[PDB]
Structure formats: C-alpha cells, structure tokens
Design a protein around this motif. Structure first.
Motif, PDB file in Angstrom:
ATOM      1  N   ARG A  58      22.257  38.514  39.102  1.00 38.56           N
ATOM      2  CA  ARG A  58      21.574  39.052  40.423  1.00 38.56           C
ATOM      3  C   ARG A  58      20.316  39.731  40.215  1.00 38.56           C
ATOM      4  O   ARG A  58      19.645  40.021  39.139  1.00 38.56           O
ATOM      5  N   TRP A  92      26.840  40.064  30.583  1.00 43.54           N
ATOM      6  CA  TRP A  92      27.914  40.088  31.557  1.00 43.54           C
ATOM      7  C   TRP A  92      28.981  39.031  31.171  1.00 43.54           C
ATOM      8  O   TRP A  92      30.231  39.363  31.653  1.00 43.54           O
ATOM      9  N   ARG A 104      32.756  39.927  31.897  1.00 45.29           N
ATOM     10  CA  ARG A 104      33.610  39.123  32.813  1.00 45.29           C
ATOM     11  C   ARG A 104      34.851  38.680  31.819  1.00 45.29           C
ATOM     12  O   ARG A 104      35.929  38.624  32.642  1.00 45.29           O
ATOM     13  N   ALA A 138      34.409  49.992  44.295  1.00 48.03           N
ATOM     14  CA  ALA A 138      34.772  48.782  45.060  1.00 48.03           C
ATOM     15  C   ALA A 138      36.150  49.053  45.428  1.00 48.03           C
ATOM     16  O   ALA A 138      36.257  48.416  46.700  1.00 48.03           O
ATOM     17  N   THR A 178      34.842  49.217  49.647  1.00 49.40           N
ATOM     18  CA  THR A 178      34.969  48.225  50.242  1.00 49.40           C
ATOM     19  C   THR A 178      36.331  47.997  51.004  1.00 49.40           C
ATOM     20  O   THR A 178      36.174  47.607  52.340  1.00 49.40           O
ATOM     21  N   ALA A 204      29.401  42.080  51.911  1.00 43.21           N
ATOM     22  CA  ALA A 204      28.252  41.729  51.073  1.00 43.21           C
ATOM     23  C   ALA A 204      27.154  41.282  51.710  1.00 43.21           C
ATOM     24  O   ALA A 204      26.117  41.601  51.017  1.00 43.21           O
ATOM     25  N   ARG A 213      20.928  35.245  43.624  1.00 38.56           N
ATOM     26  CA  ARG A 213      20.791  34.983  42.107  1.00 38.56           C
ATOM     27  C   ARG A 213      19.332  34.711  41.744  1.00 38.56           C
ATOM     28  O   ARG A 213      18.347  34.129  42.591  1.00 38.56           O
ATOM     29  N   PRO A 228      33.066  35.257  51.878  1.00 41.01           N
ATOM     30  CA  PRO A 228      32.945  36.653  51.986  1.00 41.01           C
ATOM     31  C   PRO A 228      33.191  37.381  50.717  1.00 41.01           C
ATOM     32  O   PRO A 228      32.871  38.390  50.323  1.00 41.01           O
ATOM     33  N   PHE A 229      33.795  36.471  49.754  1.00 43.53           N
ATOM     34  CA  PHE A 229      33.766  36.904  48.258  1.00 43.53           C
ATOM     35  C   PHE A 229      32.779  36.325  47.137  1.00 43.53           C
ATOM     36  O   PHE A 229      33.222  36.323  46.025  1.00 43.53           O
ATOM     37  N   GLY A 230      31.749  35.850  47.600  1.00 43.46           N
ATOM     38  CA  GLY A 230      31.040  34.819  46.909  1.00 43.46           C
ATOM     39  C   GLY A 230      31.723  33.651  46.484  1.00 43.46           C
ATOM     40  O   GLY A 230      32.678  33.153  47.123  1.00 43.46           O
ATOM     41  N   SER A 231      31.052  33.036  45.442  1.00 40.25           N
ATOM     42  CA  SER A 231      31.735  31.720  44.846  1.00 40.25           C
ATOM     43  C   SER A 231      31.415  31.576  43.346  1.00 40.25           C
ATOM     44  O   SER A 231      30.156  32.087  43.084  1.00 40.25           O
ATOM     45  N   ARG A 242      30.492  34.070  39.107  1.00 43.13           N
ATOM     46  CA  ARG A 242      30.254  35.377  39.343  1.00 43.13           C
ATOM     47  C   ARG A 242      30.767  35.979  40.649  1.00 43.13           C
ATOM     48  O   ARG A 242      30.022  36.749  41.323  1.00 43.13           O
ATOM     49  N   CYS A 269      33.546  37.568  43.360  1.00 40.08           N
ATOM     50  CA  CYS A 269      34.178  38.884  43.438  1.00 40.08           C
ATOM     51  C   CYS A 269      35.630  38.788  42.374  1.00 40.08           C
ATOM     52  O   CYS A 269      36.183  38.263  42.570  1.00 40.08           O
ATOM     53  N   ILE A 270      35.268  39.358  41.316  1.00 43.84           N
ATOM     54  CA  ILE A 270      36.766  39.571  40.464  1.00 43.84           C
ATOM     55  C   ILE A 270      37.771  40.204  41.117  1.00 43.84           C
ATOM     56  O   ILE A 270      38.694  39.803  40.558  1.00 43.84           O
TER      57      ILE A 270
HETATM   58  C1  HEM Z   1      37.464  43.258  50.990  1.00 45.01           C
HETATM   59  C2  HEM Z   1      37.195  43.692  49.649  1.00 45.01           C
HETATM   60  C3  HEM Z   1      36.008  43.035  48.868  1.00 45.01           C
HETATM   61  C4  HEM Z   1      34.979  42.016  49.171  1.00 45.01           C
HETATM   62  C5  HEM Z   1      34.839  41.410  50.788  1.00 45.01           C
HETATM   63  C6  HEM Z   1      34.125  41.711  48.014  1.00 45.01           C
HETATM   64  C7  HEM Z   1      33.129  40.964  48.059  1.00 45.01           C
HETATM   65  C8  HEM Z   1      32.209  40.588  46.975  1.00 45.01           C
HETATM   66  C9  HEM Z   1      31.275  39.722  46.854  1.00 45.01           C
HETATM   67  C10 HEM Z   1      30.818  38.992  47.947  1.00 45.01           C
HETATM   68  C11 HEM Z   1      30.801  39.918  45.490  1.00 45.01           C
HETATM   69  C12 HEM Z   1      29.517  38.836  44.852  1.00 45.01           C
HETATM   70  C13 HEM Z   1      30.001  37.497  44.557  1.00 45.01           C
HETATM   71  C14 HEM Z   1      28.711  36.768  44.382  1.00 45.01           C
HETATM   72  O1  HEM Z   1      27.738  37.417  43.981  1.00 45.01           O
HETATM   73  O2  HEM Z   1      28.870  35.419  44.337  1.00 45.01           O
HETATM   74  C15 HEM Z   1      31.521  40.741  44.779  1.00 45.01           C
HETATM   75  C16 HEM Z   1      31.503  41.041  43.339  1.00 45.01           C
HETATM   76  C17 HEM Z   1      32.221  42.016  42.884  1.00 45.01           C
HETATM   77  N1  HEM Z   1      33.285  42.682  43.251  1.00 45.01           N
HETATM   78 FE1  HEM Z   1      34.015  42.421  45.225  1.00 45.01          FE
HETATM   79  N2  HEM Z   1      34.659  42.463  46.978  1.00 45.01           N
HETATM   80  C18 HEM Z   1      35.565  43.107  47.540  1.00 45.01           C
HETATM   81  C19 HEM Z   1      36.451  43.999  46.739  1.00 45.01           C
HETATM   82  C20 HEM Z   1      36.374  44.372  45.380  1.00 45.01           C
HETATM   83  C21 HEM Z   1      37.379  44.931  44.615  1.00 45.01           C
HETATM   84  C22 HEM Z   1      38.434  45.671  45.384  1.00 45.01           C
HETATM   85  C23 HEM Z   1      36.886  45.051  43.349  1.00 45.01           C
HETATM   86  C24 HEM Z   1      37.537  45.895  42.000  1.00 45.01           C
HETATM   87  C25 HEM Z   1      38.706  46.584  42.184  1.00 45.01           C
HETATM   88  C26 HEM Z   1      35.764  44.364  43.255  1.00 45.01           C
HETATM   89  C27 HEM Z   1      35.058  43.842  42.228  1.00 45.01           C
HETATM   90  C28 HEM Z   1      33.797  43.340  41.998  1.00 45.01           C
HETATM   91  C29 HEM Z   1      33.147  42.925  40.825  1.00 45.01           C
HETATM   92  C30 HEM Z   1      33.371  43.639  39.677  1.00 45.01           C
HETATM   93  C31 HEM Z   1      31.932  42.233  41.202  1.00 45.01           C
HETATM   94  C32 HEM Z   1      31.077  41.637  40.369  1.00 45.01           C
HETATM   95  C33 HEM Z   1      31.596  40.550  39.690  1.00 45.01           C
HETATM   96  C34 HEM Z   1      30.499  39.971  38.414  1.00 45.01           C
HETATM   97  O3  HEM Z   1      29.155  40.349  38.725  1.00 45.01           O
HETATM   98  O4  HEM Z   1      30.836  39.355  37.630  1.00 45.01           O
HETATM   99  N3  HEM Z   1      35.402  43.888  44.579  1.00 45.01           N
HETATM  100  N4  HEM Z   1      32.630  41.126  45.735  1.00 45.01           N
END
Ligand code: HEM
Ligand code: HEM
Lengths: 443, 443
Positions: B77, B98, B102, B252, B256, B317, B322, B381-384, B387, B389-390
């Motif tokens: 990123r 990373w 990861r 998070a 979130t 988000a 990237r 909503p959670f990316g794809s 990388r 959302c873990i």
């Molecule tokens: C409704 C709840 C959530 C949404 C919508 C969400 C969404 C996202 C999105 C869009 C990304 C970026 C994906 C990308 O760049 O392709 C992300 C990254 C991430 N999220 Fe979430 N997230 C949520 C909750 C959480 C929770 C609860 C946790 C941990 C307890 C978390 C941990 C992370 C981490 C560690 C990353 C970075 C992963 C990486 O860079 O490898 N997220 N999230």
C-alpha cells in the motif's frame, strides 16, 4: 540504531549521538580504515551519522558480496544524495534500472570498440608531447595534473562525442567547469542530516551545477561511438537520461585517468631505475619511437606492473560499498537489511598480511612469478563482480598510451618544488596534498 | 511529475503546483471519486501533492492488480507516513516483511480459532443487552457508537489478550485512548510536504500517541489466543513488533466493527420491514431467544444480506490502493513505476452500471437469485487477493453475533433527534455527520 554492532557482537569505535563516528574522519577516511583494521581485526562496524557500515576484509567474504550475491543481496551502492536527473546515471541507478543501463552501455567498452579508439587517442598523444616540449624548453617544473587533465578531457570528449578540442591552449563547461567538485561542508551535513535529502531534491538542488548540465543537454541536442551506441538504439534510452551517462564518462575519463597518471609519473620520477627500465621496454617493443598500437601496449609487461603497483598504492576509489538488500548470513556471519557493507580497498592494499613492505613502490610484486600470490579480492583497484568498473579496459589502455608517448620523448625528475615523500590530501579524495610538479627533460 | 497522465493519454482533473488535486477533497474524497468516475469514465489519474494516483474501475483490471500480480508488482500500500515502530504492523509492512507477518498471523483467524471465540464473545453480548435495557427504561434515545464501541472493545481485548473489562461502566488507554485519531491538518501537510516524513521520524514523532503504546508495551510485558500464537513461537517475532500487531487488531476490532454496527442499526431503524423480517429469521433459527452459535449464525441468509447491503452502502475502507513496484502493462494499459493504483470502492459500490437504484438500501440484491449477478471485483468491502482483510471472517461473525443478541431483545426506531437521511462526514473517515441516536424498545 547505534546499538546494532553491539548486539551483533561486532567490534568498532564507539559512536557519538547523531554524528556517529564521522568525527574520526579528521584524518581522512583512508587513515580511519587502516587504524580500524589494525585495532579491530578482520571485521568491524561504525556509523556514518545513523547509517551502520560493516567493513569486511576476508577474501572469501568479499567475493561473496561483490560476485556471488550481487543480484540477490548486494546490488546497489549507498544512495548518492540529492542528485536530480542524475539518478539515472549508471553508477547511481539501482536494481533493474542499473541492470538495463549496464547491459545497454557494456558494448561501448568492448575490445573491438577499444581498438577503434586507439588511432583516435594517439593524435592527442602527439599534441600532449608537443605541449610538453613547450614547457620542457621553459626549464621550470611542470604541473602534471594540468597537462594530463587537458589530455584526458580531449580523449574522453572525442571518444564519447566526436568533438576534438585542444584544451591546454583554450573546453570551459567541460573540464574547466567539470573540475569543481569541492569537499564542501555540505556533504558532511548530508550524512548528519540524511533526512534532509528529500528536501533538497524538491527544491531542485543537486550536487551537480545546473548550468553545465543544461549545456551538455543542449550540446548533445545539436548533436543530431558511445554517443552513437545510445542514439542508434530492454528499453530505449531517454533524452535527459542520455545526458546522465555522458556526465559520468566525462568525469571518469577526466578526473580518474589524469589523477592516476600524475601518481605514476611521481613514482617514476622518484624511482629513476624503474623509469629507465620502463623506457628500455618501450624502446625495445617500439624501436625508433614507433607509435604505440593496441597490441604493442598489451605486450609491455613492465608497463603493466608499474601501472598495477601504482594502483595498489593509490586506489582512487578508496572504498567499495554495497547496500544489504535483505537479511543474509554470509560465510558464517549475519548481515541485517539496510547495513552498508564496505570493503576498504586502501587499507587492504597496504595490509602487511598480504604485502611485503606495503608502503614501498615495488613493481616486481606484479611480475609473472609473484603475481600468482596476489589475491584478486584483496587487490581490487577496479572493484569486482557484475558492478565493477565498466571502463577498466579503457582506463588502462588510455593511461598506457599516454605513458608510452610521454616516456618515448621525455624523462622525469624531481625538482626543488617537488614534495618528497608525497603527502596525501586529508579532504576525502585520493589526491596529493601539493600538486605534483616535476622537471621534464627531452630525451 | 504533474505531466505524467497528460503524457500517458489518461484523463483527469488538472493539478495545481505543489498541491496537486488535494483541494478537490473539500467534498471528501468519496465524493471526489464519484464525480471523477462520472466525468472521466473507466480510468483517470490525479495527484496527491506530487504523488500520481491512477484510479481503475474495470473488474478485469482490478483482479489483475489485487489478485494476479500481488507478489510481483502490487505488493504494498501507499507508505503510511511517520510511524516509528509501527512500521512493523502487518497493514503497514512491505514486501518480505509483510509476507512473514501475514503467514505468522493467519492462523489467528481460522474457523477453528473462530469457533473457540464464539463462547467467549457471547458473554459480552449479554452484558451488551443488559446495558441496553438500562437506557431502554430511561426512555430517551441511545448513542449507538458508545455502547457498540464498548462492546467491540470488550470483545477485541478478551479475544486478543484474555482481559475482560466492562467498558461502559468504566478501559482508558484502550478505547478511551484508542478513539483519538483526529482529522488533523497535519495529515494534509504530510501529503503536501511528503519530503518531511523522514524529519518527523528522526524527531521520534509518530501519528500514534507515545503513552498508549508504552502502556500496551508494558501491559503485554506483565502478560508473561492471538497473544498466545505469537508468544509460543520463517523468523520469530520481536517484543516491540509484538505490540505493533496488537494495536492494529485493537483498532480494527474497536473502530471498524462498531462503526459498521451503527450503520446497520440505522438502516434497520429506517426500514422496519427489514428489521421485522430479520427478527423473524432470528426467532425461527433460534426459537425462544436461544443463544447464537457458530453454525446458527452461518444459517441466517437474511442476516448475511443485511450485513452485505450495509457494507455496499458504507464500505469503511473507501479505497483500495497498491504501489506499482515496476513498469508494467496490465490488460492493455501501461503503469509506470511508483504510481499508486487505486480502486474506488465507495464509487464502485454506488455505480449505476452495476447497481439498480444504488442509493437505496435493498437487501434483496444479495439474495441467492441476484447474488450471482454481483461482480466480486466491483463489490470489495474487504478488499481482495492475498492482501485482503485478514479479519474478514472474525468481523462478520463478531457483528452478526451482536446483531442477533440485540434484535432478539429489542426493536429500534427513529427518534426526534435521529438524522434522516443520514449525512456522511466530509472529514475523511466514513462516519455519520451526526452521531447515530435511536429509540430502543424492549420486545
Ligand atoms: C466490517 C469490518 C471490516 C472491514 C469492512 C474491513 C475491511 C478491510 C479492507 C478493505 C482491507 C484492505 C484490503 C485490501 O487492501 O485489499 C482491510 C485490511 C486489513 N484488516 Fe480489515 N476490515 C474489517 C475488520 C477487521 C478486523 C475486525 C480486523 C482484525 C481483528 C481486521 C484486520 C485487518 C488487517 C490486519 C488488514 C491488513 C492486512 C494486510 O495488509 O495483509 N480488519 N480490512
Ligand atoms: C584508473 C582509472 C579507474 C579506476 C581505478 C576505476 C575504478 C572504479 C571502481 C573501483 C569502481 C567501483 C567498482 C565496484 O563498486 O565494485 C568503478 C565504477 C565505475 N567506473 Fe571506474 N575506474 C577508472 C576509470 C573509469 C573510466 C575511464 C570510466 C569510463 C569512461 C569508468 C566508468 C565507471 C562506471 C560507469 C562505474 C560504475 C559501474 C556500475 O555501477 O555498474 N571508470 N570504477
């Protein structure tokens, strides 16, 4: 960051906050490297500001860094500083950009292109001789770096751009505006304030002067074999990137060759028996002052020995360096990412463990008998590996051609103004404290 | 650098010197992305200060960036800014660092570890209910982000550290000192002065407050499953790097989940028929207010649809990004090195080309009939990719467990103070302009 080598178990001089060990450069960093080697042994570490630097002296480990792991771990030198468009110069570029530039510019220095330049650079060897006779009749000593610099600039310009200008009687933007390059207190503030490099870049501040760069930029513009090899054409070159390589070659052609030539002539003047033996070889190989050719230069063994022994005493690069790209464990030692690995060429060239009487000028070190006992990773005047000096063949040939033409006609002696022994400047660059002046007598 | 997209033939808003297009963020960058998409079409480019940013909307091209070429081209990123020791947080780390983080942290979110947390987080679902009855008898509307934030913080602390603190009646360093995070004019000056990031770093300035970080640092010190999975152990983790991942998960977990939960409850309050249908599903799957289990949550189709449609309208988000690592040519378009490729999730989620009546809350979009017509690279909503959302599985389960326990006991209605329609804040983060207040009635 100043606790790294303490946690690695690696010895070194205790660094000061912010500054690191840079205050120990008061003696020049060549003396710093020699004293550190003597005090700490095979390996030691120090800090340029906050930047940790690991010095290595083991030949096995040097070969692993320079040769074995060049592409995977040790690809790049330490970042240059505020460069501007000179970031695309081959000696500054990093990773795949360097790989492309190294591949595109390697054909410039082939032995075929080298043989073509010998008839071109022999015309200046005769102008150099005539210029020398002028001051030979004068009777007073000559400043070698002036006449050799004019020669080296004439050679590099014509071989690179095809422009033929007699520099001594004139040439300004090149040479007269190529010299500059001071040991500013700005470079010291760069390592103390390395976080300020992005500031100077955005202000369009660079170490190179903006007027000469735009002169070459417009010089090569109206210019519409090295200049040909890039134009006639991985990925095609760019206009502003075209100029960047020209500045490096011009500087390497001028500064490097003429500095080493002055060191050689000093050693020849203070060792008349070496000068006479070299003159006898040249007269034997080239009877009746025959013009030197590509193949006759390669036949002169004693000429090669004299050039090599001078480059041992005066390795103008002083240090080799590579940035550690990732956590690695080489030859039983662990290098963390971001550490600059440095090979102290100057100290290794004067190490009593590999050299007998290391301070003495003795060309017989490099004779066919004793040359086999010389480790190629202790004696590294041109570096080693895929990122060694790309102009090594050209530099050696260019210097020997000047030496042959010069010694066929003249003998060199110390004068009253000659500094004996030569004292090296402490201000960074490997150059004499006093400019080398010598008496020139026609043979 | 402000002539890049003009030379690429890529349309976009004309940038101002130094600033770029950042002044067009006065409407918030979600409105900026929607207007740019409407005006420039499938692809456009703009500048954050001097940083060029390329926005892409084609699903084929998005999949190439997020999935196909993640490890080779699009690994990282956009750099975070002055971070300090938080550079080792997984969402901030780059390249092989990373990759290690990861790999080391992926076991935390497995369905086995997920099933173990459900009996742990159901105890707070009952405290959340009791806390809700207190204000339900009060008779005045409730601030959802307060009670949901307390719940989310309680859940994340116990699931991460094993500490169990009822936040509403108390908890300070966490939550009360986790909120902070203002839309400072400092972040705007960071993009205008990105050359100053190394300055703030050397001054030990970071966006995170130094007192909370040292609290967690000493909190986890006296702490001698996520906290267990790192301790019990590529390359082993570090003490200060241990704390970095905890801060991300805490943020998070808290920020979130509780923000999305408030958005869901707002939509349920303004769509009583949806709220009633969801309540009927929960009573059918869990008769007589049965406690929700891992498997019963996965059986609730309408619950999944309501959560998905809310995440369509409010993708917190807002953007996926990237950094282009090298010159590439994707799907017939050339991306130069250093360009930030951005996917505007908010604009894609509200694009009339893929969504009928995109501004309307309609859970039937995600029914088994119509879900097949939803492109996974338009709705992100959670990316794809590698990388993404873990914590996606944990977040969905955590939110649904809170929703089930909440709707089994209460119904939610608008009050006089409720903002209808909801107005989104223009200050960066996807949050309501006015905090969501709702009337809560016991069933
Ligand atoms: C409704 C709840 C959530 C949404 C919508 C969400 C969404 C996202 C999105 C869009 C990304 C970026 C994906 C990308 O760049 O392709 C992300 C990254 C991430 N999220 Fe979430 N997230 C949520 C909750 C959480 C929770 C609860 C946790 C941990 C307890 C978390 C941990 C992370 C981490 C560690 C990353 C970075 C992963 C990486 O860079 O490898 N997220 N999230
Ligand atoms: C006596 C003359 C010279 C000496 C002693 C010398 C020495 C060196 C050394 C030690 C290096 C670094 C090698 C390494 O890091 O391993 C180097 C690099 C380089 N030299 Fe020279 N050099 C000389 C003349 C020249 C000349 C005449 C040219 C061009 C006309 C030239 C062009 C270059 C370039 C382009 C590099 C960087 C190569 C790369 O980064 O790939 N040098 N030189």
């Amino acid at each position: 960051s100043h606790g790294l080598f303490k946690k690695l178990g690696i010895p070194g001089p205790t660094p000061l906050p912010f500054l690191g060990n840079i205050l120990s450069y008061h003696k020049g960093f060549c003396m710093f490297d020699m004293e550190c080697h003597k005090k700490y042994g095979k390996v030691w570490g120090f800090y340029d500001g906050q930047q940790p630097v690991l010095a290595i002296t083991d030949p096995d480990m040097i070969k692993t860094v320079l040769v074995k792991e060049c592409y995977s771990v040790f690809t790049n030198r330490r970042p240059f500083g505020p460069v501007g468009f000179m970031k695309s110069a081959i000696s500054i570029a990093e990773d795949e950009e360097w790989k492309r530039l190294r591949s595109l510019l390697s054909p410039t220095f082939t032995s075929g292109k080298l043989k073509e330049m010998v008839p071109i650079i022999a015309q200046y060897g005769d102008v150099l001789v005539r210029n020398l006779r002028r001051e030979a009749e004068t009777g007073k000593p000559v400043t070698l770096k002036d006449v050799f610099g004019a020669y080296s600039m004439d050679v590099i310009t014509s071989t690179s751009f095809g422009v033929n200008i007699d520099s001594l009687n004139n040439v300004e933007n090149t040479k007269k505006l190529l010299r500059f390059d001071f040991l500013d207190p700005f470079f010291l503030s760069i390592t103390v304030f390395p976080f300020l490099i992005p500031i100077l870049e955005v202000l369009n501040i660079c170490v190179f002067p903006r007027e000469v760069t735009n002169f070459l930029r417009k010089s090569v513009k109206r210019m519409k074999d090295f200049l040909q090899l890039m134009i006639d054409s991985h990925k095609a070159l760019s206009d502003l990137e075209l100029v960047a390589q020209s500045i490096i070659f011009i500087f390497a052609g001028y500064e490097t060759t003429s500095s080493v030539l002055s060191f050689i002539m000093y050693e020849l003047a203070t060792h008349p028996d070496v000068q006479q033996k070299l003159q006898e070889e040249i007269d034997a190989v080239l009877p009746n002052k025959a013009p030197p050719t590509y193949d006759t230069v390669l036949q002169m063994e004693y000429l090669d020995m004299v050039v090599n022994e001078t480059l041992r005493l005066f390795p103008i690069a002083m240090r080799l360096e590579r940035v550690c790209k990732k956590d690695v464990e080489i030859n039983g030692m662990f290098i963390p990412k971001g550490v600059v690995v440095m090979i102290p060429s100057y100290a290794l060239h004067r190490d009593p463990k590999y050299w007998t009487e290391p301070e003495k000028f003795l060309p017989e070190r490099f004779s066919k008998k004793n040359k086999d006992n010389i480790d190629p990773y202790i004696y590294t005047p041109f570096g080693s590996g895929p990122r060694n000096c790309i102009g090594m063949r050209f530099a050696l040939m260019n210097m020997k051609l000047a030496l042959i033409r010069v010694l066929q006609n003249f003998s060199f002696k110390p004068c009253k103004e000659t500094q004996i022994p030569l004292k090296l400047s402490l201000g960074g660059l490997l150059q004499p404290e006093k400019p080398v002046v010598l008496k020139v007598e026609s043979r």
